[PDB]
C-alpha cells in the first residue's frame, strides 16, 4: 500500500548526467522525509542524499556538488539529479520514504533503478534458443548485450517454477546470460514455450520461440 | 563518518538453530538526552530491496516475526534469531542514523547447510541460429543441489560460468555453462561432454553427445 517506483536509470558515459525519478503512491506524501540509497557492484550499500519534510537537503560527501536531491510534493515524486558521474557511481539506486513523520529512516524502499557508467556503446541483445523418458529441459541464451540489465520471461511470464535464470556475465562489454526451464516430456513440444526478453533503453523487445532443431543438411 | 562493522563474514546454519549477529560501531549511537540508540537492522532477500527489520536497535518493525529480536546498545549491538527458517536465507545489514553520513556495515551472508543433494545436469548443443551468425556455445545446467562446493569439466581455452545464490525454497544452488567456441572449430571435433564432481559424487555424473553433424 506504500509503493515507490524508480524511473529513468540506465547508462551514461563518464562526466554525464542523469535525473532519476521515484514515483510514490499510497500515503500523505508531504508528511514524510525521503532519501536515496545506492548499492555498489560489490553489493555494498551506500547512503546518498536525504531531503527533510521542509526541503533541508543532506548529501554524502562523495557526491556533494554533483548530485542534487529534490522533491515535488504536488505530484508525489522525488528526484536525484546526478551530474558528472564517476566510475564509482555505477550502482543500483533506491529511493526511500521516511519511517514515520520523523527523520530519514529507510522505512520503505523502491525496487531500485540501475545506473551503469562506462563509456561503452548501447548494444541490443541476441537471443539463441537452447533446444535439446522422464522430463526434458530447454534453455535460452543472451549473448552480447550492454548495458545491463535485461528481463527474461518464459511464455510471457506464465512459467513459474523450474526456471533457474542466471546472473549476467560481462566479458568485453557484452553480458552473457542463460536460463533453464524444465517440464515433463509430455509438455514440450506439446505446448509452445517461448523465451521472452526485453532490453531497455535500446528500446528492444524480443521473443524467441523454442522450436526443435530439425534434420536438414543438404 | 561513523564506521559500522559486521562479523563474521560468512556463516552456515540449519533450520531451527539460533543466529547471533554482531554490529560493531566506531562511536556511541546512544544519546544521553533521550537514552535512545540510533541503530537499525535490515534483511535483503537476493534480487530485492532490503526490508527494515529492527530499529532503535531493539524495536521490531510492524510485520516483523517474533523470532527476530533486537538487543544491544551504544557501540555493540546484536540481532537475535530464535528459530532460523529458510525464508531467512539472505544477507543482513546494520545501519546508524545518529549523524551523517548514514552508514551501513559489511553485511553477513548466512549460507544455509541442509543436506547434500544430487545435481541434475542437462547438456545443450548450439542452436541452429547461433551458428548462422558466427559462433557457437554448448551449455550444461546443474540444478537443485547442495553443496555449492562442486567444480565441473579436453581443451579449455575460454569458458564462462554463473552460479545462483541459494534458493530460498529448497536451499539449493544451480550452475550455468557458457562453453563458447568458434563456429568452424566446433566441427574440428565430434565428441562433446560435460562432467560434474560433487561431494557425494565420487564416481562423477556425466552428460554427453556427439556432434549432430557426424
Amino acid at each position: 500500500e506504500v509503493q515507490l517506483q524508480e524511473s529513468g536509470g540506465g547508462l551514461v558515459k563518464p562526466g554525464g548526467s542523469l535525473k532519476l525519478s521515484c514515483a510514490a503512491s499510497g500515503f500523505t506524501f508531504s508528511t514524510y522525509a525521503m532519501s536515496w540509497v545506492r548499492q555498489t557492484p560489490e553489493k555494498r550499500l551506500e547512503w546518498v542524499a536525504s531531503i527533510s519534510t521542509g526541503d533541508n537537503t543532506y548529501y554524502t560527501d562523495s557526491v556533494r556538488g554533483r548530485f542534487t536531491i529534490s522533491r515535488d510534493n504536488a505530484r508525489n515524486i522525488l528526484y536525484l539529479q546526478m551530474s558528472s558521474l564517476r566510475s564509482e557511481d555505477t550502482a543500483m539506486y533506491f529511493c526511500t520514504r521516511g519511517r514515520g513523520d520523523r527523520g530519514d529512516l529507510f522505512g520503505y524502499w523502491g525496487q531500485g533503478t540501475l545506473v551503469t557508467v562506462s563509456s561503452a556503446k548501447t548494444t541490443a541483445p541476441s537471443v539463441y534458443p537452447l533446444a535439446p523418458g522422464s522430463s526434458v529441459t530447454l534453455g535460452c541464451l543472451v549473448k552480447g548485450y550492454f548495458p545491463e540489465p535485461v528481463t527474461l520471461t518464459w511464455n510471457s511470464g506464465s512459467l513459474s517454477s523450474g526456471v533457474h535464470t542466471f546472473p549476467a556475465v560481462l566479458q568485453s562489454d557484452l553480458y552473457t546470460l542463460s536460463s533453464s526451464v524444465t517440464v515433463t516430456s509430455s509438455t514440450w513440444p506439446s505446448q509452445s514455450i517461448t523465451c521472452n526478453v526485453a532490453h531497455p533503453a535500446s528500446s528492444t523487445k524480443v521473443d524467441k520461440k523454442i522450436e526443435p532443431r530439425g534434420p536438414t543438411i543438404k | 563518518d561513523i564506521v559500522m562493522s559486521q562479523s563474521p563474514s560468512s556463516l552456515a546454519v540449519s533450520v531451527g538453530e539460533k543466529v547471533t549477529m554482531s554490529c560493531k560501531s566506531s562511536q556511541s549511537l546512544l544519546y544521553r538526552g533521550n537514552q535512545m540508540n540510533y541503530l537499525a537492522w535490515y534483511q535483503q532477500k537476493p534480487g530485492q530491496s532490503p526490508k527494515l527489520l529492527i530499529y532503535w536497535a531493539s524495536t521490531r518493525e510492524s510485520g516483523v516475526p517474533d523470532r527476530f529480536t533486537g538487543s544491544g546498545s551504544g557501540t555493540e549491538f546484536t540481532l537475535t534469531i530464535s528459530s532460523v527458517k529458510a525464508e531467512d536465507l539472505t544477507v543482513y545489514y546494520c545501519q546508524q542514523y545518529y549523524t551523517y553520513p548514514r552508514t551501513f556495515g559489511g553485511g553477513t551472508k548466512l549460507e544455509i547447510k541442509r543436506a547434500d543433494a544430487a545435481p541434475t545436469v542437462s547438456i545443450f548443443p548450439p542452436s541452429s541460429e547461433q551458428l548462422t551468425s558466427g559462433g557457437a556455445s554448448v551449455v550444461c545446467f546443474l540444478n537443485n543441489f547442495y553443496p555449492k562446493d562442486i567444480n565441473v569439466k579436453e581443451r579449455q581455452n575460454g569458458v564462462l560460468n554463473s552460479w545462483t545464490d541459494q534458493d530460498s525454497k529448497d536451499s539449493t544452488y544451480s550452475m550455468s555453462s557458457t562453453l563458447t567456441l568458434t563456429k568452424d572449430e566446433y566441427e574440428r571435433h565430434n565428441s562433446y561432454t560435460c562432467e560434474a564432481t560433487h561431494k557425494t559424487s565420487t564416481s562423477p555424473i556425466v552428460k554427453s553427445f556427439n556432434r549432430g553433424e557426424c
Binding site: 533446444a131 535439446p132 526434458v136 526443435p212 532443431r213 530439425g214 534434420p215 536438414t216 543438411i217 | 548443443p125 541452429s128 553427445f209 556427439n210 556432434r211 549432430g212 553433424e213
Partner: peptide, 6 residues
C-alpha cells in the same frame, strides 16, 4: 540430422 532433440 538434428541428432535427436532429446
Amino acid at each position: 540430422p538434428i541428432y535427436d532433440i532429446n
